[PDB]
Design a binder for these strands. Sequence first.
RNA 1: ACCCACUCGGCACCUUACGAGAAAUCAAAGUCUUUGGGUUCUGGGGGGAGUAUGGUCGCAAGGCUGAAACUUAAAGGAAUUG
RNA 2: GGUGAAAUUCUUGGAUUUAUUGAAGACUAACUACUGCGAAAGCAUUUGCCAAGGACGUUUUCAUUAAUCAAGAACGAAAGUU
RNA 3: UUGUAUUGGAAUGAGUACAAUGUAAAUACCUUAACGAGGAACAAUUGGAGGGCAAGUCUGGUGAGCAGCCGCGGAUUCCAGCUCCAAUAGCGUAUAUUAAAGUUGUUGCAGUUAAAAAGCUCGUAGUUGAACUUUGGGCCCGGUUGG
RNA 4: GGAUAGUGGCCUACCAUGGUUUCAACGGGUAACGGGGAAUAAGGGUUCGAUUCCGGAGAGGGAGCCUGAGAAACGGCUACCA
Lengths: 48, 619
Amino acid sequence: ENDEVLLAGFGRKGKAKGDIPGVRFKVVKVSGVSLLALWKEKKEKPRS
Amino acid sequence: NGHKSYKSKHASKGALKRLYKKPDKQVSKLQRKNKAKQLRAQRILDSIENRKLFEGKNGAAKIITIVPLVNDLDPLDILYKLLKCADDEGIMDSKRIFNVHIKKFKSNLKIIIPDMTNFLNILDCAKVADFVVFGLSGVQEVDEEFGEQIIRALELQGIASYIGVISNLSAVHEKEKFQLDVKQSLESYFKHFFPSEERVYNLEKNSDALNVLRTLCQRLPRSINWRDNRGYVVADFVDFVESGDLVIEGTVRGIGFNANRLVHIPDFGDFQLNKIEKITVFESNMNRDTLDEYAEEEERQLREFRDMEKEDREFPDEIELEPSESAIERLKRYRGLKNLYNCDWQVDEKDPSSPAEWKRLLRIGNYKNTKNRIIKETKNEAQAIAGDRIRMFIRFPKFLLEKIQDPKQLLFAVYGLLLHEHKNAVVNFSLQRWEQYDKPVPSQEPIVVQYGVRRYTIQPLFSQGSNSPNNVHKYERFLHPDTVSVATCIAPVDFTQSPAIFFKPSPTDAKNIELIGHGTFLNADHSRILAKRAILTGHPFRFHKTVVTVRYMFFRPEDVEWFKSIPLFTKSGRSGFIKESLGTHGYFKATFDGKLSAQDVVAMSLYKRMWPMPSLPWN
RNA sequence: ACCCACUCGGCACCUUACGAGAAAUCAAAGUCUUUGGGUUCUGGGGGGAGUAUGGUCGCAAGGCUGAAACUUAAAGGAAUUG
RNA sequence: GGUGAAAUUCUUGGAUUUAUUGAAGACUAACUACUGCGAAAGCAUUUGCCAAGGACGUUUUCAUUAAUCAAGAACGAAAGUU
RNA sequence: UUGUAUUGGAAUGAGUACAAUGUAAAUACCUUAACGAGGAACAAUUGGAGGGCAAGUCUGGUGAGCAGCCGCGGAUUCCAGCUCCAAUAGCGUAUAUUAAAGUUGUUGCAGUUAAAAAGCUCGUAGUUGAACUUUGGGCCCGGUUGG
RNA sequence: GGAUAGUGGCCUACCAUGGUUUCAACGGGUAACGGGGAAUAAGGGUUCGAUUCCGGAGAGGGAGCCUGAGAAACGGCUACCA
């Protein structure tokens, strides 16, 4: 909580995606670092 | 029905009868424009309200901390090169804390320099800063055993803002293109820890050093969540009066203070303030909270854990009985269950190994709805607020006076407590291993944990994370080599979900500390029942079309009878049950879901309640 | 009045398909990817909805005109058969 | 009398049923159909009056006066309003 | 003359550098003495392997994950390791727009039963409106292209 | 008639009652500066053009004016509003 995040569309032009009722957006970056880089252990998140 | 029904694009009135049981506005261009303008006025006024705190010599100072990552550097070179670009030599001594006003930017700066010998004192200094200036050397690269551990630790407690600086790159001159090659390497390294930043300044160049100075003066820092919900001040001076009445003066920086609060000092513990004044006086009105807590042989020990953890990894919770051992007297405490997720195990069980404190313990339930509620009241009750110059009078035990140092030479800092945080409770932590800490961790072994400012010696209990409907979970002997885990103990609560760091003292190491893991204060939850599981095992050896008989699991007919009711299972996954005792040696015969064979093993599971141990401060 | 032949106009019926069609079927539902005789009206996946709001007609009951936010992967037509 | 069965109701001052007469309001059976008329809604006992209409017949007359149609206008089952 | 593994001489720029050239003065390109490759560590990535749509009956785990769509799982679709495919100094994602689209249709849609012919007739603006008037036949010149 | 460098309801006096519109006037909206041009190649089209050239407008918002062949100028002046 109180993290800052960047959001992008979930790929369906304003519709929700697949199984998920009413969820239309996906997280792309947190605190200025990309989630993909965290998942692959390429960068590190500074706390706040 | 069998009939082609009627169709209409909208419902007929017949259909509606069975089913049974201000103006719109157009935005004209002017009022469209007007709204946007008066909205912008709010945004701009709001930006001023933030900035007024730093506005000038009448405002608050900004706290800068310098941390050289290599002893080659000497921090005085860093500060000196900054001060030159202020272009006022009247700015530029037997001390490590400095107050400066910069005419060029009408800005007030406080510089704190930590003693690089005391690793723990670095964290305490950096914990209070708005800006941390990292010094890098172009000549010698940071060492993994010390220099990196500074960076890694500071990130996990949280940092308000950071700047990368170089001060000596000309020491490798041949042509400045060779300097650029090095600078690119340092930036690529630095960005690994701080991917928000893409520039490292070279202070040997006037343009860069001026650029750095401007940033410290003009720009605002990030907030630190767990800190700013409390109050804190830094001591300008300290004085003592008669068992003592210690006086501190400084500036408020957190959410605020009230004279009825409690005050924590990281090395010494909690104390009560008696008065406040503004540089009007406020006094501790006794309708207040109070200080109550309630209402080479080691090679063998290391080898033991290394061997035992290897065994537990292969065959978890398996137990051996022995001949002439009573299974009852060994094991009577174990209840035996079909499934932990389905058992009705009572939380505040009355068994004698339960701690003496139960009603003595604070229990909360909805931690979320408690946390936010408490803060809302606290910010409303604040008497002194950010930027107030203040004096404070504190009940200070006179014998600790031997531990006081002149604040000009060492960082002395003061933190307000939240109301109930002094009370002990059952607390839960997330935990995962440090970057390469492959050592085995025994579940009972004592550890020192820092979370927020305060730190405690703790002996944990480990378990895996899941959402069981009853909060019952398996106790585990050792920390999993990979997954995150939940650790439980008794400690004083924190409402701010502070980050937590896990380490063990080791004066054999250059930094006196061995680093083990990190995590977060999750919640207080007494319902988080831990059950110690045990597995007994025996060998099926004779086989019939309807029953099988099993050896070695028990040695007395009395024991087979006493434990008859607990279900059996094979590790190949079949269930079964005891029929009856056979003979005097404790053989039994049993029935299962299907065909077994001597390549299978027969097991049974039993469960015992566990309770958290208490904990004590560390210094 | 009736019978036989012819003819103009009309409500229908039976057989056939050079034709057409998703098929039931159709003398028009034909003269269409080989796409142009003249001209009026209406539709653009399923719900929200003939709802809300504005206007206008009526003594009243009500008539005419008539959205959007949001939601969803189908709804629907003809025919035979296990 | 009425129903699957029964009760409310009428009647020994006579019900229901039979005979001779009278009054009122509505409707137009059978003939009546793969038949007729009308712009559509719709239209069926006889006779009289009023005005209108299609098709046919025509070696009469005018000579492009025409086709479709926003606005505007006449009519419009049953129920409903004064 | 073509594949699969121990072994040998040759070739070169990326990079660095005397010099000249370059330029207002410089940096870099073009030229060049010296130095500069054997796991030639002087080490190429980004997305996938049920179908649409190129490419796994491989193997270990498990009973939260994947998936634009259809679907997998109480395992050819998850997770890990081999192997394979595609584009390649580039490759993926979000949003808007164009094409495929004859789902805006003048070229070129549709209205019995699938969304869509207004209860019916009159009628102004608008769009549209039958046939007919010098046609045919002679006599010179005549350019271009090919016989 | 006045005023302008000069034509003209540009302004003043007197007089007449005109002017535009279903071939859409008047009013509302534009996340609207116009054009040369840009993307998308069967053909017809659809979407975009703040931005290297041409033309217009403005110098925080409105108004006024000096000097000069040329300005209602803002790296000129004067007043009000913020």
